[PDB]
Amino acid sequence: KPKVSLNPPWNRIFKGENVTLTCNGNNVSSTKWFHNGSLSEETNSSLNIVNAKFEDSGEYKCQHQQVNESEPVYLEVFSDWLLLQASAEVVMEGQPLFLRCHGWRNWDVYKVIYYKDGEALKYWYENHNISITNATVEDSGTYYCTGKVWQLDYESEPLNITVIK
Amino acid sequence: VQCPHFCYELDYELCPDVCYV
Numbered sequence: 001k002p003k004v005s006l007n008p009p010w011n012r013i014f015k016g017e018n019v020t021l022t023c024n025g026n027n028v029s030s031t032k033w034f035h036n037g038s039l040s041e042e043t044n045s046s047l048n049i050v051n052a053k054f055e056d057s058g059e060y061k062c063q064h065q066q067v068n069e070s071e072p073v074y075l076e077v078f079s080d081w082l083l084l085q086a087s088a089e090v091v092m093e094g095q096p097l098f099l100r101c102h103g104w105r106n107w108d109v110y111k112v113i114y115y116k117d118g119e120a121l122k123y124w125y126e127n128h129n130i131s132i133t134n135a136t137v138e139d140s141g142t143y144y145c146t147g148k149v150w151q152l153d154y155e156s157e158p159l160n161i162t163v164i165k
Numbered sequence: 166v167q168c169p170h171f172c173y174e175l176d177y178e179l180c181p182d183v184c185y186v
């Protein structure tokens with residue numbers, strides 16, 4: 001039973017960014033990559049996505065010599081001013097949860113506010129990540145952030161985050 | 166969605182899609 005991992009860990013990213021999916025390397029032979037069900041021409045344990053296009057969005061799976069395939073990993077490509085990024089959208093109670101109010105082309109974001117279910121959780125003048133050290137079921141809900149890029153105010157698309165047991 | 170001038174002034178479009186069309 002293998003498992004795909006992302007680096008950076010963000011499943012949600014901007015059009016043009018880069019991400020690398022890694023097939024749980026442990027225990028050499030070959031690595032099969034499935035993008036949207038189709039077999040990709042990649043054979044390494046690490047599939048490199050560069051200059052991400054919307055097309056790159058979708059389900060990804062890897063297969064080693066362990067018969068069974070890996071659990072699906074969904075990647076989504078956006079193109080907005082701010083994008084709320086999460087270390088994971090389904091967290092297990094007890095583990096950390098990381099949220100990042102990511103700005104277009106890495107441009108500066110000021111007056112960053114993170115909201116949960118409509119409520120403003122934290123404010124930061126300089127952009128800053130929000131980190132939930134010990135995830136609680138209470139921490140579930142729909143999050144989003146707002147900030148200022150190029151002196152203008154922008155809001156990010158909401159993201160559902162669920163913390164199970 | 167309001168975008169800065171440069172998104173339209175410049176040659177190449179540097180801003181998110183939400184700014185165009």
Ligand SMILES: *[C@@H]1O[C@H](CO)[C@@H](O[C@@H]2O[C@H](CO)[C@@H](O[C@@H]3O[C@H](CO)[C@@H](O[C@@H]4O[C@H](CO)[C@@H](O)[C@H](O)[C@@H]4O)[C@H](O[C@@H]4O[C@H](CO)[C@@H](O)[C@H](O)[C@@H]4O)[C@@H]3O)[C@H](O)[C@H]2NC(C)=O)[C@H](O)[C@H]1NC(C)=O
Nearest residue numbers: 035036038054055056057058059075076077182183185186
């Ligand atoms: C793997 O599976 C993925 C899903 O799991 C799949 O993701 C989807 O890919 C689409 C592109 O292949 C994503 O983009 C959408 O593409 C259209 C096409 O450009 C884009 O604009 C549209 O263009 C059409 C023709 O050029 C027009 O007829 C249409 O009116 C529209 O303009 C979409 O953006 C739009 O922006 C509009 C405002 O500017 C808005 O009104 C529209 O509603 C729309 O948002 C759009 O980006 C699509 O988002 C992807 N879906 C998801 C959930 O991410 C991958 O493509 C698959 N890849 C492979 C290799 O299989």
Ligand SMILES: *[C@@H]1O[C@H](CO)[C@@H](O[C@@H]2O[C@H](CO)[C@@H](O[C@@H]3O[C@H](CO)[C@@H](O)[C@H](O)[C@H]3NC(C)=O)[C@H](O)[C@H]2NC(C)=O)[C@H](O)[C@H]1NC(C)=O
Nearest residue numbers: 008013014015016017018019048049050051052104105106
């Ligand atoms: C996603 O990964 C890409 C790497 O494949 C990055 O894009 C490439 O970045 C390089 C450097 O930024 C560019 O090439 C060279 O860059 C050096 C130093 O920056 C210059 O001295 C060289 O002149 C330049 N080479 C040339 C021929 O001009 C690449 O051109 C550039 N693009 C591509 C398609 O390779 C992305 O920056 C990276 N994105 C992120 C967010 O990390």
Ligand SMILES: *[C@@H]1O[C@H](CO)[C@@H](O[C@@H]2O[C@H](CO)[C@@H](O[C@@H]3O[C@H](CO)[C@@H](O)[C@H](O)[C@@H]3O)[C@H](O)[C@H]2NC(C)=O)[C@H](O)[C@H]1NC(C)=O
Nearest residue numbers: 076089116117118140141142143144157158159160161162
């Ligand atoms: C993220 O979580 C929110 C909150 O639970 C989800 O919102 C809910 O979305 C469903 C549909 O997906 C809504 O139900 C539908 O409502 C319409 C209108 O009443 C009805 O015609 C349908 O039969 C269905 O019942 C639900 O009302 C809505 N709730 C809230 C508070 O917004 C949302 O779907 C999740 N987002 C994603 C992308 O999964």
Ligand SMILES: *[C@H]1O[C@H](CO)[C@@H](O)[C@H](O)[C@H]1NC(C)=O
Nearest residue numbers: 093094095096133134135136
């Ligand atoms: C959450 O898990 C931590 C371990 O990091 C534990 O010490 C703490 O007591 C737990 N919190 C709650 C409210 O159970």
